[PDB]
């Protein structure tokens, strides 16, 4: 290709400055959102338990009614 | 409807080159010094016929660069496929965003 060109020092300084700022901002935001995800999982565990209990009871009763209706249709 | 544009003069401009703009010599947008960029934008008319003419002139410039030469390659066709796939992804922006893998990002 063409002979190499040294980049402008301002471009290199801003690029690596943005790289450093990106690393520390990524570390800070990941540490911030990890606690938020942990709290969300804490409340979602209780929400999952309540939803699972109610949905399993509703599904079991609906399954019983559906099997009774199909036995009525088939006559067995 | 098909006819040459009214600025085309076959006794002055030679044979018809559809990628060439035969009107008055306006400054191309590349070399506008951006202090007169609003004046340049106001100078060009925004008529749909002029817009379709500028699109057709650009498409003929691309044809002249990548297809109309004799030993042309498959680079123009890959450019069309990638340009159509990017455009049709931007059209379906919601249909692909609504099936993401991560939440926060």
């Amino acid at each position: 290709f063409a002979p190499p060109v040294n980049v402008s020092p301002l471009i290199r300084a801003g690029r690596y400055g943005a790289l450093v700022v990106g690393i520390v901002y990524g570390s800070y935001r990941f540490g911030s959102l990890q606690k938020r995800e942990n709290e969300w999982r804490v409340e979602e565990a209780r929400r999952k338990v309540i939803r699972d209990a109610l949905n399993a009871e509703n599904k079991a009763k609906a399954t019983r009614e559906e099997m009774l209706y199909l036995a009525k249709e088939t006559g067995v | 409807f098909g006819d040459y544009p009214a600025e085309y003069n076959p006794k002055v401009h030679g044979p018809y080159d559809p990628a060439r703009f035969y009107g008055k010599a306006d400054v191309p947008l590349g070399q506008v010094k951006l202090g007169e960029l609003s004046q340049w934008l106001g100078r060009r008319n925004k008529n749909p016929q002029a817009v379709a003419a500028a699109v057709s002139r650009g498409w003929w410039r691309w044809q002249h660069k990548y297809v109309l030469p004799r030993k042309g390659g498959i680079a123009p066709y890959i450019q069309l496929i990638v340009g159509c796939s990017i455009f049709f992804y931007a059209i379906n922006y919601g249909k692909m965003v609504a099936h993401r893998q991560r939440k926060y990002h």
Partner: protein, 216 residues
């Protein structure tokens, strides 16, 4: 979401712009001696025109270009539609029905208007007995009636099945496991070679069947 490829209701600029794609991929001719793609496109079109002229006959002057344009329309929508985010127009039954029904009507109505008694004699296939003659008449009527359905279905349902089989393999292509990804990509290479061949074969099938229906 599996079937989300077949949702034309996309944005303000809808997926009906997938029909302007053949205007981009059609060769434009400027110089007297053609380029490589113009010559290749013209050579393929001349070859198919010579193949269809055998089945057409001399009383079908308009069938030289009317079936070639339909072949290129179907071929470009089937071929450039298989690229990933590009919407496939001929997957939907509406576009294939829009291509098959009007030309089939232009064959049936024009044959009935032009040669009525010749068509009525053409109902009997030259040797079947008279007790089987009304059955052959009903068979011919039904077989001509389900002609445009069997073209639109054979194009739309084949393209829908050909892209759903790719979408099923794409959805199982996890990125964490490189082995599963490589299996998916290799199987999709086999499947996409099959789909490109099926796309060109189905466009040639439609051109052949429209030529045979035009001549008969």
């Amino acid at each position: 979401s599996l079937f989300s490829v077949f949702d034309p209701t996309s944005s303000f600029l809808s997926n009906w712009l997938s029909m302007l794609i053949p205007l981009l991929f059609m060769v434009m001719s400027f110089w007297l001696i053609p380029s490589r793609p113009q010559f290749l496109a013209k050579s393929v079109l001349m070859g198919l025109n010579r193949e269809m002229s055998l089945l057409m006959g001399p009383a079908s002057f308009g069938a030289n270009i009317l079936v070639i344009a339909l072949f290129l329309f179907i071929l470009f929508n089937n071929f450039i539609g298989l690229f990933p985010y590009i919407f496939t127009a001929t997957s939907h039954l509406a576009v294939t029905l829009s291509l098959a029904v009007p030309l089939w009507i232009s064959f049936i109505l024009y044959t009935w208007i032009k040669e009525t008694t010749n068509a009525l004699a053409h109902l009997v296939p030259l040797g079947t007995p008279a007790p089987l003659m009304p059955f052959m008449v009903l068979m011919e009527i039904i077989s001509n009636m389900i002609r445009p359905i069997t073209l639109s279905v054979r194009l739309a349902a084949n393209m829908i099945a050909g892209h759903l089989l790719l979408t099923l393999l794409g959805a199982q292509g996890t990125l964490e496991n490189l082995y599963v990804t490589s299996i998916v990509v290799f199987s999709q290479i086999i499947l996409l070679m099959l789909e490109f061949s099926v796309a060109i074969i189905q466009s040639y099938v439609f051109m052949t069947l429209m030529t045979l229906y035009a001549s008969e």
